[PDB]
Amino acid sequence: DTSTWFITITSMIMTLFILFQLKISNYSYPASPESIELKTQKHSTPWEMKWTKIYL
Amino acid sequence: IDTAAKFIGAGAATVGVAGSGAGIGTVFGSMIIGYARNPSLKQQLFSYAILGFALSEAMGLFCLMVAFLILF
Amino acid sequence: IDTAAKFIGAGAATVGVAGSGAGIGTVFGSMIIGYARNPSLKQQLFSYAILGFALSEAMGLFCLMVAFLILF
Amino acid sequence: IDTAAKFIGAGAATVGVAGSGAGIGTVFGSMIIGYARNPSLKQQLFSYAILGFALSEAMGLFCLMVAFLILF
Amino acid sequence: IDTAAKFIGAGAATVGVAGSGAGIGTVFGSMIIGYARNPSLKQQLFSYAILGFALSEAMGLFCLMVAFLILF
Amino acid sequence: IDTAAKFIGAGAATVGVAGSGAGIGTVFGSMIIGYARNPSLKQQLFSYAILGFALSEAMGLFCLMVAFLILF
Amino acid sequence: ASVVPLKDRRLLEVKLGELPSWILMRDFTPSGIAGAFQRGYYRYYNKYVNVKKGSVAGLSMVLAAYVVFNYCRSYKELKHERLRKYH
Amino acid sequence: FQFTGIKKYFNSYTLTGRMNCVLATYGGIALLVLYFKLRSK
Amino acid sequence: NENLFASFIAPTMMGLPIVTLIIMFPSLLFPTPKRLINNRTISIQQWLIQLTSKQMMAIHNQKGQTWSLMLMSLIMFIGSTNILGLLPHSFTPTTQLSMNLGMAIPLWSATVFTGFRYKTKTSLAHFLPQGTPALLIPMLVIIETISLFIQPVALAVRLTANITAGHLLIHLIGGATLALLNINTMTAFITFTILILLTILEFAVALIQAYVFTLLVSLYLHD
Amino acid sequence: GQMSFTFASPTQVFFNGANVRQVDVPTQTGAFGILASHVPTLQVLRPGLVVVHAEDGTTSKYFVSSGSVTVNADSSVQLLAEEAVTLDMLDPGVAKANLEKAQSELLGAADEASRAEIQIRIEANEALVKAL
Amino acid sequence: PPLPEHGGKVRLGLIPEEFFQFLYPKTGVTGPYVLGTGLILYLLSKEIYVITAETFSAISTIGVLVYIVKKYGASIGAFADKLNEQKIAQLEEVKQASIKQIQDA
Amino acid sequence: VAYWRQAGLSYIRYSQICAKAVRDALKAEFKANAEKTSGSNVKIVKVK
């Protein structure tokens, strides 16, 4: 109850923070998916500008 | 001899809750005058009523924690 | 010594149940300053008071069983 | 007699949280009304209540630490 | 029995720090309701809370130092 | 036995300074929402602030002189 | 014995909640779209019917296993039984 | 392989986060008073 | 003299069985998928993170955002290990005061050594609040430093003391039902008090906001 | 009930004698709600949006700049505003750029009242973005 | 409250008939039920062994978890909704990607 | 009282600036109605 002596649990808590940093590290953010559509637009526009400079 | 001292040390420990019996009386009286000004209750104004309630009852009930330990 | 120990643990616990009367002073009282700005009366305005009135009394009738828990 | 006076010794010092037990009701009943008037909580207007809560719940468990150090 | 009064004396003497509990719950909540109406915090608005915090704190730790000096 | 009643009442008196700790909080709290509307600070705001501070002290300090009177 | 207990959870996942995607498992993913929740259903009475996309019988079996596993440790302490049986 | 998934994370923040020595010292001293009180019973 | 309550005198036991199984067990409640579309039970776990990762991100807005990918692991562990224990005979590791003194101090002292490796002067020159008046320099810097070292004790003891306080009212209001072989009308009202109190004891999720957040404010203020 | 809501620009008129039960106005000294019999006041406006809730299913999201709200003794209001435009006439893209340029001149202001003019300009663009 | 006490009492007249119609479903199992009476003994024998304690709060933590199964039939939409919302973005992206590439040629 | 108060300004001088910013955030279509009002045409004649 008023328990005692403490040599227990606290060494078994930091092994747990090797688990939770393994699972939650492999998550996906919805926002990152909206960023890859932006750089694809500017690249072909500059490639068309490279084709416009191939005209001009 | 300490059988009474079991009691009053528990009997005095219980009146430390008497703050939070009034402390939630503030946060519900202070919400209706935050509401009659601005009727947007489904927004975060009601969500600050419960977190203010829960953080006050968190300091409310654990004053009765020391009451039972003196008993049991 | 038995009836000596019981009663002064019981009276000193009932102090905490009027410790929530000072909250419903604010709950029932701060309805006044809200009602005068806006008369939307039978809306959640009076009903938020009941969420204040019976939750602050719920810390009032909290300790009163604990007093009768140490009556016996 | 050393044990019995300790039993009532921590019973009186339980109620030191009763100041913080309702002092946390006011400051979380004053951001219900400061967000109602001007919705700019995401700046200083929320971090001035938790900083209000840290420097006021520093004094709730401050006294129960003494009621432990008088017990054991 | 001489040490028996040394323990129950600091039992109620640290209830005086609860007065710096509920008294600090206002002056940190009043910098909520009076900040939104006038954003000038880096001027003497925040500085009159730190004076309002510290000099309200000075009557908190003074009633702590009684409980040390009554015991030793 | 004479030291038994002396060492309780010295702690039983200094709970009287807790109520001064409450009333001193509003005086630096209402001046926050008092000055927030009206920046006329160097005039009689602060002069009514210092008088309000040193008058609540004299209901807290006056028990403290009586508190040391019990010991001697 | 490590490949023995690891092949217990990978059997009690991919059958009764919830059989994921990543093709080489694409039709194995829709195998959980019908689900074995119809197989898991009949134990309670009928009532936990909401298991369609928030699957109760997938989760509420582990938590029913963790209760009766912790009933064993408590059994020594709260004995209470007379020289008979109860009602 | 419970390392190189999170090894870029460790030497970033364990410079301040892996200071359990203060926990070890406040733990190891907390061992001492409880063996001492049972020694004097 | 109508309704006489009863009580039962029995020891309330926070025993210590084999813990290192019980700690690992709320890790395997959460799976992680290596797929694009997931399977409608991780997908409401994956959404629940992307809410409260957008509230411990917004305040900081620095190059101290690297720290914040850990702080959402700290919320799922004591978010789970406080919610598992509401079951009939389960055991919570955050009941014992041992590990919480190992959750505060390796995290709290990871904050004061964060600015002291980069700023080295103005981290604890935050002890200087304003345009210094004369009569209260010693009354200030003995106060604002005694409310600094309280913070590790203020952070751990607020968690252990109210979590276990939930468990005793679960027993004592519950145990008074069993010993109520007197008048049977009042048995239901004590039972109805329980099933309200178990709803209030899902504020064990609400008390993890007040552990990660006052760790952010104790990180944002120093850095 | 039994209200009158009037909403007029200098050049155009939105509402004349047609009230719908709830008006939300951004006041200079806070905010308020009108709920069929509010205690009458004489207030003036800050930059912010007015969301009039029509009966009519839905709301109406206007955005005033500086005007005057006069709720009076009988249940009738008169909200007059100078630049009362809707949302779709504004562009968010130009409103993002106008903020930090006025913050750049804020440090570069030598006088005390000329700097006070800059503090007016940053406040209006701040309510511009957050309304969008 | 005069109207609210009858409102549960009208539910008391409602639940006694709904329990009666549910008792009609067991009357349809007067002959054909061979499932429960195989396993109703182990919960009658073990309940004659040890299982009584201070755990009437075992049911109330299992009773509240029944009320959330009600809203779980709406959690399929939110869970379902998340998947659909997730699905629309890729569809928009592929179409958006396709038009740009073809017209640049 | 605000920062435009206690520094020596008027409410028209407040209302000129915050209404001018709304006429800069408009599009190219509704820029002519910002040119329409544009009330700077009255000259100032004081005899000294």
Side-chain angles (χ1 to χ4, degrees), chain D residues 33-68:
Chain D
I33 213 157
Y35 174 51
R37 155 177 324 171
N38 195 352
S40 92
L41 87 95
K42 293 326 187 215
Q43 213 178 328
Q44 323 274 305
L45 214 49
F46 183 46
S47 93
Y48 275 34
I50 278 305
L51 186 140
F53 153 71
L55 309 180
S56 179
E57 207 85 349
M59 212 87 53
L61 59 94
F62 195 81
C63 174
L64 255 65
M65 190 185 84
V66 168
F68 276 176

mmCIF file of all heavy atoms in Angstrom, chain D residues 33-68:
data_model
loop_
_atom_site.group_PDB
_atom_site.id
_atom_site.type_symbol
_atom_site.label_atom_id
_atom_site.label_comp_id
_atom_site.label_asym_id
_atom_site.label_seq_id
_atom_site.Cartn_x
_atom_site.Cartn_y
_atom_site.Cartn_z
ATOM 1 N N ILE D 33 -14.703 33.669 -19.397
ATOM 2 C CA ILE D 33 -15.278 34.979 -19.684
ATOM 3 C C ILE D 33 -14.293 35.857 -20.443
ATOM 4 O O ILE D 33 -14.674 36.870 -21.030
ATOM 5 C CB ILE D 33 -15.757 35.632 -18.378
ATOM 6 C CG1 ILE D 33 -16.975 36.481 -18.638
ATOM 7 C CG2 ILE D 33 -14.694 36.504 -17.761
ATOM 8 C CD1 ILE D 33 -17.782 36.675 -17.427
ATOM 9 N N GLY D 34 -13.022 35.483 -20.467
ATOM 10 C CA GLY D 34 -12.065 36.258 -21.230
ATOM 11 C C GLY D 34 -11.882 35.712 -22.626
ATOM 12 O O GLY D 34 -11.268 36.351 -23.477
ATOM 13 N N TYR D 35 -12.375 34.497 -22.867
ATOM 14 C CA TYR D 35 -12.462 33.993 -24.232
ATOM 15 C C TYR D 35 -13.812 34.349 -24.847
ATOM 16 O O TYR D 35 -13.932 34.485 -26.071
ATOM 17 C CB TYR D 35 -12.224 32.484 -24.250
ATOM 18 C CG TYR D 35 -12.421 31.825 -25.593
ATOM 19 C CD1 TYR D 35 -11.805 32.324 -26.730
ATOM 20 C CD2 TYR D 35 -13.197 30.690 -25.723
ATOM 21 C CE1 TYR D 35 -11.999 31.740 -27.962
ATOM 22 C CE2 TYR D 35 -13.374 30.083 -26.950
ATOM 23 C CZ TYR D 35 -12.766 30.615 -28.062
ATOM 24 O OH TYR D 35 -12.932 30.030 -29.287
ATOM 25 N N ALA D 36 -14.837 34.545 -24.008
ATOM 26 C CA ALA D 36 -16.153 34.932 -24.506
ATOM 27 C C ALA D 36 -16.143 36.327 -25.115
ATOM 28 O O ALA D 36 -16.742 36.557 -26.167
ATOM 29 C CB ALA D 36 -17.175 34.852 -23.379
ATOM 30 N N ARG D 37 -15.447 37.265 -24.478
ATOM 31 C CA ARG D 37 -15.422 38.640 -24.961
ATOM 32 C C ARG D 37 -14.571 38.773 -26.211
ATOM 33 O O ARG D 37 -15.002 39.358 -27.205
ATOM 34 C CB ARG D 37 -14.903 39.570 -23.866
ATOM 35 C CG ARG D 37 -14.258 40.868 -24.356
ATOM 36 C CD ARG D 37 -13.842 41.733 -23.187
ATOM 37 N NE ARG D 37 -14.812 41.592 -22.117
ATOM 38 C CZ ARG D 37 -14.659 42.069 -20.896
ATOM 39 N NH1 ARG D 37 -13.560 42.734 -20.590
ATOM 40 N NH2 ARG D 37 -15.606 41.879 -19.989
ATOM 41 N N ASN D 38 -13.360 38.255 -26.178
ATOM 42 C CA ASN D 38 -12.451 38.423 -27.282
ATOM 43 C C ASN D 38 -11.884 37.055 -27.626
ATOM 44 O O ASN D 38 -11.006 36.551 -26.912
ATOM 45 C CB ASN D 38 -11.336 39.401 -26.922
ATOM 46 C CG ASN D 38 -10.569 39.894 -28.128
ATOM 47 O OD1 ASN D 38 -10.747 39.412 -29.241
ATOM 48 N ND2 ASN D 38 -9.679 40.844 -27.901
ATOM 49 N N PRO D 39 -12.353 36.424 -28.662
ATOM 50 C CA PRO D 39 -11.743 35.160 -29.093
ATOM 51 C C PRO D 39 -10.339 35.322 -29.672
ATOM 52 O O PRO D 39 -10.117 35.429 -30.882
ATOM 53 C CB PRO D 39 -12.753 34.654 -30.118
ATOM 54 C CG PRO D 39 -14.038 35.163 -29.609
ATOM 55 C CD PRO D 39 -13.749 36.524 -29.100
ATOM 56 N N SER D 40 -9.364 35.384 -28.767
ATOM 57 C CA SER D 40 -7.942 35.261 -29.070
ATOM 58 C C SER D 40 -7.237 34.375 -28.046
ATOM 59 O O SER D 40 -6.241 34.783 -27.451
ATOM 60 C CB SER D 40 -7.260 36.625 -29.140
ATOM 61 O OG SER D 40 -6.721 37.014 -27.887
ATOM 62 N N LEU D 41 -7.760 33.164 -27.796
ATOM 63 C CA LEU D 41 -7.244 32.346 -26.697
ATOM 64 C C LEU D 41 -5.890 31.733 -27.043
ATOM 65 O O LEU D 41 -5.099 31.426 -26.147
ATOM 66 C CB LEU D 41 -8.238 31.235 -26.328
ATOM 67 C CG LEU D 41 -8.255 29.856 -27.023
ATOM 68 C CD1 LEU D 41 -7.435 28.814 -26.249
ATOM 69 C CD2 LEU D 41 -9.617 29.292 -27.257
ATOM 70 N N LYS D 42 -5.624 31.515 -28.336
ATOM 71 C CA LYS D 42 -4.475 30.727 -28.778
ATOM 72 C C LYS D 42 -3.153 31.425 -28.505
ATOM 73 O O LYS D 42 -2.111 30.768 -28.448
ATOM 74 C CB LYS D 42 -4.597 30.416 -30.273
ATOM 75 C CG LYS D 42 -5.762 29.479 -30.680
ATOM 76 C CD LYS D 42 -6.085 28.394 -29.636
ATOM 77 C CE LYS D 42 -7.116 27.372 -30.139
ATOM 78 N NZ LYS D 42 -8.034 26.872 -29.063
ATOM 79 N N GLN D 43 -3.186 32.740 -28.319
ATOM 80 C CA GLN D 43 -2.075 33.536 -27.816
ATOM 81 C C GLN D 43 -2.066 33.418 -26.297
ATOM 82 O O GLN D 43 -2.474 32.389 -25.751
ATOM 83 C CB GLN D 43 -2.177 34.998 -28.281
ATOM 84 C CG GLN D 43 -0.827 35.713 -28.523
ATOM 85 C CD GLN D 43 -0.990 37.133 -29.028
ATOM 86 O OE1 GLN D 43 -1.942 37.444 -29.742
ATOM 87 N NE2 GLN D 43 -0.068 38.008 -28.644
ATOM 88 N N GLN D 44 -1.539 34.447 -25.623
ATOM 89 C CA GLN D 44 -1.371 34.508 -24.169
ATOM 90 C C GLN D 44 -2.603 34.085 -23.361
ATOM 91 O O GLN D 44 -2.463 33.700 -22.199
ATOM 92 C CB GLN D 44 -0.987 35.931 -23.776
ATOM 93 C CG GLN D 44 -0.065 36.633 -24.750
ATOM 94 C CD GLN D 44 1.400 36.347 -24.493
ATOM 95 O OE1 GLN D 44 1.904 36.565 -23.393
ATOM 96 N NE2 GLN D 44 2.098 35.863 -25.514
ATOM 97 N N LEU D 45 -3.801 34.121 -23.942
ATOM 98 C CA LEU D 45 -5.013 34.060 -23.139
ATOM 99 C C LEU D 45 -5.353 32.649 -22.670
ATOM 100 O O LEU D 45 -6.330 32.466 -21.939
ATOM 101 C CB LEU D 45 -6.160 34.655 -23.935
ATOM 102 C CG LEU D 45 -7.217 35.402 -23.148
ATOM 103 C CD1 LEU D 45 -6.553 36.382 -22.206
ATOM 104 C CD2 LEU D 45 -8.092 36.128 -24.152
ATOM 105 N N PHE D 46 -4.583 31.635 -23.075
ATOM 106 C CA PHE D 46 -4.717 30.321 -22.435
ATOM 107 C C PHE D 46 -3.491 30.000 -21.608
ATOM 108 O O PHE D 46 -3.591 29.383 -20.544
ATOM 109 C CB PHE D 46 -4.937 29.227 -23.472
ATOM 110 C CG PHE D 46 -5.149 27.852 -22.888
ATOM 111 C CD1 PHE D 46 -6.006 27.655 -21.830
ATOM 112 C CD2 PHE D 46 -4.504 26.756 -23.414
ATOM 113 C CE1 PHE D 46 -6.219 26.403 -21.315
ATOM 114 C CE2 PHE D 46 -4.733 25.503 -22.903
ATOM 115 C CZ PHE D 46 -5.579 25.331 -21.848
ATOM 116 N N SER D 47 -2.324 30.451 -22.060
ATOM 117 C CA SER D 47 -1.093 30.165 -21.341
ATOM 118 C C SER D 47 -0.954 31.048 -20.112
ATOM 119 O O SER D 47 0.033 30.948 -19.383
ATOM 120 C CB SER D 47 0.109 30.347 -22.261
ATOM 121 O OG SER D 47 0.622 31.657 -22.155
ATOM 122 N N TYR D 48 -1.902 31.955 -19.895
ATOM 123 C CA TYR D 48 -1.914 32.721 -18.661
ATOM 124 C C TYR D 48 -2.845 32.087 -17.644
ATOM 125 O O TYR D 48 -2.998 32.603 -16.534
ATOM 126 C CB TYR D 48 -2.347 34.156 -18.927
ATOM 127 C CG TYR D 48 -1.272 35.107 -19.367
ATOM 128 C CD1 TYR D 48 -0.223 34.684 -20.161
ATOM 129 C CD2 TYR D 48 -1.332 36.445 -19.018
ATOM 130 C CE1 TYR D 48 0.745 35.554 -20.572
ATOM 131 C CE2 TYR D 48 -0.365 37.326 -19.422
ATOM 132 C CZ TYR D 48 0.667 36.872 -20.202
ATOM 133 O OH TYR D 48 1.641 37.731 -20.616
ATOM 134 N N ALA D 49 -3.497 30.981 -18.004
ATOM 135 C CA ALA D 49 -4.310 30.270 -17.021
ATOM 136 C C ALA D 49 -3.590 29.030 -16.505
ATOM 137 O O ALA D 49 -3.709 28.680 -15.328
ATOM 138 C CB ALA D 49 -5.658 29.900 -17.623
ATOM 139 N N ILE D 50 -2.831 28.357 -17.372
ATOM 140 C CA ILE D 50 -1.995 27.234 -16.951
ATOM 141 C C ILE D 50 -0.815 27.729 -16.125
ATOM 142 O O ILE D 50 -0.470 27.146 -15.090
ATOM 143 C CB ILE D 50 -1.551 26.435 -18.187
ATOM 144 C CG1 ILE D 50 -2.662 25.478 -18.609
ATOM 145 C CG2 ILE D 50 -0.242 25.736 -17.980
ATOM 146 C CD1 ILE D 50 -3.124 24.555 -17.524
ATOM 147 N N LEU D 51 -0.201 28.836 -16.549
ATOM 148 C CA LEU D 51 0.765 29.525 -15.700
ATOM 149 C C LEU D 51 0.094 30.068 -14.445
ATOM 150 O O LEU D 51 0.741 30.246 -13.411
ATOM 151 C CB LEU D 51 1.435 30.647 -16.484
ATOM 152 C CG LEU D 51 2.585 31.455 -15.894
ATOM 153 C CD1 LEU D 51 3.598 31.700 -16.981
ATOM 154 C CD2 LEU D 51 2.117 32.777 -15.323
ATOM 155 N N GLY D 52 -1.201 30.355 -14.522
ATOM 156 C CA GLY D 52 -1.950 30.620 -13.313
ATOM 157 C C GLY D 52 -2.199 29.361 -12.514
ATOM 158 O O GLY D 52 -2.349 29.411 -11.294
ATOM 159 N N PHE D 53 -2.259 28.213 -13.191
ATOM 160 C CA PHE D 53 -2.550 26.960 -12.498
ATOM 161 C C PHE D 53 -1.287 26.337 -11.914
ATOM 162 O O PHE D 53 -1.333 25.711 -10.849
ATOM 163 C CB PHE D 53 -3.261 26.004 -13.458
ATOM 164 C CG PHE D 53 -3.057 24.547 -13.166
ATOM 165 C CD1 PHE D 53 -3.644 23.946 -12.075
ATOM 166 C CD2 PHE D 53 -2.306 23.773 -14.026
ATOM 167 C CE1 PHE D 53 -3.461 22.622 -11.832
ATOM 168 C CE2 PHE D 53 -2.128 22.452 -13.790
ATOM 169 C CZ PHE D 53 -2.705 21.870 -12.691
ATOM 170 N N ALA D 54 -0.153 26.495 -12.599
ATOM 171 C CA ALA D 54 1.103 25.978 -12.067
ATOM 172 C C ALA D 54 1.494 26.707 -10.791
ATOM 173 O O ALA D 54 1.876 26.075 -9.802
ATOM 174 C CB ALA D 54 2.212 26.098 -13.110
ATOM 175 N N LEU D 55 1.342 28.027 -10.771
ATOM 176 C CA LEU D 55 1.766 28.791 -9.607
ATOM 177 C C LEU D 55 0.654 28.881 -8.574
ATOM 178 O O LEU D 55 0.733 29.683 -7.639
ATOM 179 C CB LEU D 55 2.226 30.179 -10.032
ATOM 180 C CG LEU D 55 3.241 30.182 -11.175
ATOM 181 C CD1 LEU D 55 3.649 31.585 -11.553
ATOM 182 C CD2 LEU D 55 4.458 29.364 -10.833
ATOM 183 N N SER D 56 -0.412 28.094 -8.739
ATOM 184 C CA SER D 56 -1.407 28.003 -7.678
ATOM 185 C C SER D 56 -1.643 26.565 -7.245
ATOM 186 O O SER D 56 -2.182 26.323 -6.160
ATOM 187 C CB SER D 56 -2.722 28.628 -8.103
ATOM 188 O OG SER D 56 -3.650 28.490 -7.047
ATOM 189 N N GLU D 57 -1.289 25.595 -8.094
ATOM 190 C CA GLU D 57 -1.265 24.212 -7.629
ATOM 191 C C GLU D 57 0.141 23.822 -7.193
ATOM 192 O O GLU D 57 0.405 22.665 -6.852
ATOM 193 C CB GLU D 57 -1.804 23.262 -8.702
ATOM 194 C CG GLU D 57 -2.428 21.953 -8.163
ATOM 195 C CD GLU D 57 -3.890 22.079 -7.767
ATOM 196 O OE1 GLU D 57 -4.407 23.211 -7.699
ATOM 197 O OE2 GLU D 57 -4.527 21.036 -7.531
ATOM 198 N N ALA D 58 1.057 24.787 -7.178
ATOM 199 C CA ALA D 58 2.287 24.604 -6.424
ATOM 200 C C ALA D 58 2.020 24.631 -4.926
ATOM 201 O O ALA D 58 2.846 24.159 -4.144
ATOM 202 C CB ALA D 58 3.310 25.672 -6.799
ATOM 203 N N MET D 59 0.877 25.189 -4.506
ATOM 204 C CA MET D 59 0.631 25.408 -3.084
ATOM 205 C C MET D 59 -0.438 24.469 -2.547
ATOM 206 O O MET D 59 -0.756 24.490 -1.353
ATOM 207 C CB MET D 59 0.225 26.854 -2.859
ATOM 208 C CG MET D 59 0.647 27.421 -1.531
ATOM 209 S SD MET D 59 2.304 28.063 -1.744
ATOM 210 C CE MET D 59 2.020 29.113 -3.156
ATOM 211 N N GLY D 60 -1.015 23.642 -3.411
ATOM 212 C CA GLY D 60 -1.953 22.646 -2.924
ATOM 213 C C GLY D 60 -1.252 21.435 -2.344
ATOM 214 O O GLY D 60 -1.510 21.042 -1.204
ATOM 215 N N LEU D 61 -0.327 20.855 -3.105
ATOM 216 C CA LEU D 61 0.423 19.699 -2.629
ATOM 217 C C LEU D 61 1.624 20.126 -1.794
ATOM 218 O O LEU D 61 2.386 19.282 -1.311
ATOM 219 C CB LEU D 61 0.851 18.847 -3.829
ATOM 220 C CG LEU D 61 1.735 19.489 -4.920
ATOM 221 C CD1 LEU D 61 3.244 19.278 -4.726
ATOM 222 C CD2 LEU D 61 1.315 19.072 -6.324
ATOM 223 N N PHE D 62 1.821 21.431 -1.632
ATOM 224 C CA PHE D 62 2.923 21.955 -0.845
ATOM 225 C C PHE D 62 2.675 21.684 0.623
ATOM 226 O O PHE D 62 3.610 21.463 1.394
ATOM 227 C CB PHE D 62 3.060 23.451 -1.057
ATOM 228 C CG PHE D 62 4.348 24.010 -0.593
ATOM 229 C CD1 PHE D 62 5.475 23.902 -1.387
ATOM 230 C CD2 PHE D 62 4.440 24.648 0.622
ATOM 231 C CE1 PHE D 62 6.678 24.423 -0.977
ATOM 232 C CE2 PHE D 62 5.634 25.168 1.040
ATOM 233 C CZ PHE D 62 6.760 25.053 0.238
ATOM 234 N N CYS D 63 1.404 21.729 1.017
ATOM 235 C CA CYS D 63 1.067 21.571 2.422
ATOM 236 C C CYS D 63 0.867 20.101 2.784
ATOM 237 O O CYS D 63 1.168 19.685 3.909
ATOM 238 C CB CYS D 63 -0.173 22.403 2.742
ATOM 239 S SG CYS D 63 -0.815 22.192 4.401
ATOM 240 N N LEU D 64 0.385 19.289 1.838
ATOM 241 C CA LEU D 64 0.234 17.860 2.101
ATOM 242 C C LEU D 64 1.585 17.160 2.172
ATOM 243 O O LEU D 64 1.692 16.062 2.727
ATOM 244 C CB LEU D 64 -0.645 17.217 1.035
ATOM 245 C CG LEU D 64 -2.057 16.903 1.516
ATOM 246 C CD1 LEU D 64 -2.809 18.171 1.841
ATOM 247 C CD2 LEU D 64 -2.792 16.091 0.468
ATOM 248 N N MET D 65 2.624 17.775 1.608
ATOM 249 C CA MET D 65 3.980 17.283 1.815
ATOM 250 C C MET D 65 4.399 17.448 3.269
ATOM 251 O O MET D 65 5.140 16.619 3.805
ATOM 252 C CB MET D 65 4.939 18.019 0.880
ATOM 253 C CG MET D 65 6.343 17.451 0.813
ATOM 254 S SD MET D 65 7.478 18.437 -0.194
ATOM 255 C CE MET D 65 8.012 19.677 0.980
ATOM 256 N N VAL D 66 3.911 18.500 3.932
ATOM 257 C CA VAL D 66 4.208 18.692 5.349
ATOM 258 C C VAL D 66 3.395 17.721 6.197
ATOM 259 O O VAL D 66 3.897 17.160 7.181
ATOM 260 C CB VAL D 66 3.964 20.162 5.742
ATOM 261 C CG1 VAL D 66 3.982 20.364 7.254
ATOM 262 C CG2 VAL D 66 5.004 21.048 5.089
ATOM 263 N N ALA D 67 2.148 17.454 5.791
ATOM 264 C CA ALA D 67 1.308 16.511 6.529
ATOM 265 C C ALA D 67 1.806 15.078 6.377
ATOM 266 O O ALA D 67 1.457 14.208 7.181
ATOM 267 C CB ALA D 67 -0.142 16.619 6.071
ATOM 268 N N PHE D 68 2.608 14.809 5.344
ATOM 269 C CA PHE D 68 3.321 13.538 5.278
ATOM 270 C C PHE D 68 4.557 13.558 6.163
ATOM 271 O O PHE D 68 4.826 12.591 6.885
ATOM 272 C CB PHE D 68 3.710 13.212 3.836
ATOM 273 C CG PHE D 68 2.617 12.548 3.038
ATOM 274 C CD1 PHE D 68 2.806 12.267 1.691
ATOM 275 C CD2 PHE D 68 1.411 12.195 3.631
ATOM 276 C CE1 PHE D 68 1.817 11.658 0.952
ATOM 277 C CE2 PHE D 68 0.416 11.588 2.898
ATOM 278 C CZ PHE D 68 0.619 11.319 1.558
#
